[PDB]
Enzyme design. Structure first.
Site, mmCIF file in Angstrom:
data_model
loop_
_atom_site.group_PDB
_atom_site.id
_atom_site.type_symbol
_atom_site.label_atom_id
_atom_site.label_comp_id
_atom_site.label_asym_id
_atom_site.label_seq_id
_atom_site.Cartn_x
_atom_site.Cartn_y
_atom_site.Cartn_z
ATOM 1 N N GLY A 176 0.900 -1.117 -0.101
ATOM 2 C CA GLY A 176 -0.126 -0.030 -0.138
ATOM 3 C C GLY A 176 0.792 1.255 0.013
ATOM 4 O O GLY A 176 2.010 1.393 -0.825
ATOM 5 N N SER A 177 0.448 2.177 0.604
ATOM 6 C CA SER A 177 1.173 3.527 0.641
ATOM 7 C C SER A 177 2.421 3.481 1.290
ATOM 8 O O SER A 177 3.106 4.586 1.046
ATOM 9 C CB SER A 177 0.218 4.465 1.251
ATOM 10 O OG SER A 177 -0.344 4.363 2.461
ATOM 11 N N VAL A 178 2.857 2.632 1.927
ATOM 12 C CA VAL A 178 4.384 2.665 2.186
ATOM 13 C C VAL A 178 5.217 2.479 1.158
ATOM 14 O O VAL A 178 6.511 2.719 1.255
ATOM 15 C CB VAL A 178 4.939 1.457 3.438
ATOM 16 C CG1 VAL A 178 4.952 1.911 4.667
ATOM 17 C CG2 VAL A 178 4.367 0.028 2.991
#
Ligand SMILES: [Co+2]
Ligand SMILES: [Co+2]
Ligand code: NA
Length: 446
Positions: A156-158
């Site tokens: 995801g957004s990491v």
């Protein structure tokens, strides 16, 4: 007549013992685990015959068990294995991981601490760790393995460190560029929305990563293009085992660019459609911590022969991912993720991860899990992550955290964030070494 080889020990980087053998009788050698569950995910356990059953006891059994002599052939006693782990750091982190799991209600929690410069594994822990001093057959309700290396997840957004690193490295943006970010776009045939609804927002490039704008990430990624983006994914080590020296390491999964569909590029830059282990995730931020040079993580520091002579493990080859200037610029930008602002405008997604007096830098992660019944994403089941660097101006430690679908913050407050666990670990690492202590960053322009 057989003269049995004596089993070597497993110790941490300072020779604090994790596993050692004492002689006893029914001729019976008894394996001792003085820390109980401490680092048992890594260390493993022993079988009835005194050989390794799982973990490093098993994967390094040949090194640890030696070879029985006879009378004449001399017994080759087991060598001692020196881990990169620091038992003091492991113990604190492993405790914090357990309580973060209890407090957040997550299915499981794990954390990895790397040395920023060398990539050595200083701590690697999961919740619910089994006790190798007790029989494994009574511990079906415990974690027997090492998910930090065995169990990949969608970042995801990491994963947005990749997009940020690529746009800066190729000279395609700068931290203070004022952007125009719509609330949604159509790209690659699909529609991507920001995790909040909004019209066109004047986020800076800094603010795109500080606020975790999916749409802003994809617009910037269009400047990079598929080939330069995929090349950067590979340089960051994704989809490849690190070679850390632990059994059961997963390689994760990255679709090679010649197999992409029309929508792949709309998914990968925001962390959907690929998977990585916690170690790979933390290794990515180590590259940026180490002025752009990724050093694959290692957990075996050295081996000590029965005559007491120590041989260091060979250091892995460097990988230049971005320039030192790019890495320093990315670390400074990621300070915006932990920046607090009472008026909201200039606050990142992880203000509770900041530690006052230090230039903490990192990135929150949210990623939808896949519903086994439909082959499609859950609406409300997430991998929550945090990856950060202590500190931006002087990288010493790289910390990566994953929470499997928490119901609360890692400290039990409302929300879903792993940022308070980073706060606890990073702040403790600073204080225990007495690390000594600019204007606010602009995430949103006029
Ligand atoms: Co909620
Ligand atoms: Co605090
Ligand atoms: Na990967």
């Amino acid at each position: 007549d057989v003269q049995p080889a004596a089993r070597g020990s497993i110790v941490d980087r300072n020779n604090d013992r994790l596993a050692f053998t004492i002689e006893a009788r029914a001729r019976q050698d008894l394996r001792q685990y003085p820390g109980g569950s401490l680092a048992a995910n890594v260390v493993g356990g022993i079988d009835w015959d005194g050989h390794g059953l799982l973990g490093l006891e098993d994967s390094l059994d040949a090194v640890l068990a030696g070879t029985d002599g006879s009378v004449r052939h001399k017994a080759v006693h087991g060598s001692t294995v020196v881990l990169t782990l620091d038992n003091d750091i492991q113990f604190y982190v492993q405790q914090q991981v357990q309580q973060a799991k209890n407090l957040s209600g997550a299915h499981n929690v794990s954390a990895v601490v790397l040395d920023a410069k060398t990539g050595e594994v200083l701590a690697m822990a999961n919740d619910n760790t089994f006790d190798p001093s007790q029989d494994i057959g009574r511990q079906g309700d415990k974690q027997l393995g090492n998910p930090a290396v065995s169990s990949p997840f969608e970042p995801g957004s990491v994963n947005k460190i990749v997009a940020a690193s690529a746009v800066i490295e190729h000279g395609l943006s700068s931290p203070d560029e004022v952007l125009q970010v719509p609330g949604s776009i159509q790209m690659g045939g699909v529609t991507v929305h920001d995790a909040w609804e909004h019209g066109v927002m004047p986020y800076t490039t800094t603010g795109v990563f500080g606020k975790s704008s999916n749409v802003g990430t994809l617009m910037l990624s269009q400047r990079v293009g598929p080939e330069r983006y995929y090349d950067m994914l590979r340089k960051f080590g994704l989809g490849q085992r690190t070679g850390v020296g632990l059994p059961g390491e997963s390689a994760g999964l990255v679709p090679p660019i010649d197999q992409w569909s029309g929508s792949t590029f709309a998914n990968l830059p925001i962390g959907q459609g690929l998977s990585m282990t916690l170690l790979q995730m933390t290794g990515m931020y180590q590259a940026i911590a180490n002025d752009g040079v990724r050093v694959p993580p290692r957990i075996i520091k050295a081996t000590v022969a029965p005559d007491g002579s120590r041989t260091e493990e060979p250091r892995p080859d460097d990988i230049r991912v971005v320039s030192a200037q790019t890495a320093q610029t990315v670390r400074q930008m990621l300070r915006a993720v932990v920046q607090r602002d009472p008026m909201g405008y200039q606050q990142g997604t992880g203000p509770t991860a900041g530690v006052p007096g230090y230039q903490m830098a990192g990135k929150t992660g949210t990623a939808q899990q896949i519903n086994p019944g439909c082959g499609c994403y859950f609406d409300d089941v997430y991998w929550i992550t945090f990856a950060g660097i202590a500190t931006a101006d002087n990288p010493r430690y790289v910390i990566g955290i994953m929470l499997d679908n928490p119901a609360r913050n890692s400290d039990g407050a409302p929300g879903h964030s792993a940022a308070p666990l980073f706060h606890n670990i990073a702040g403790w690492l600073m204080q225990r070494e007495n690390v000594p202590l600019g204007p606010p960053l602009v995430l949103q322009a006029t």
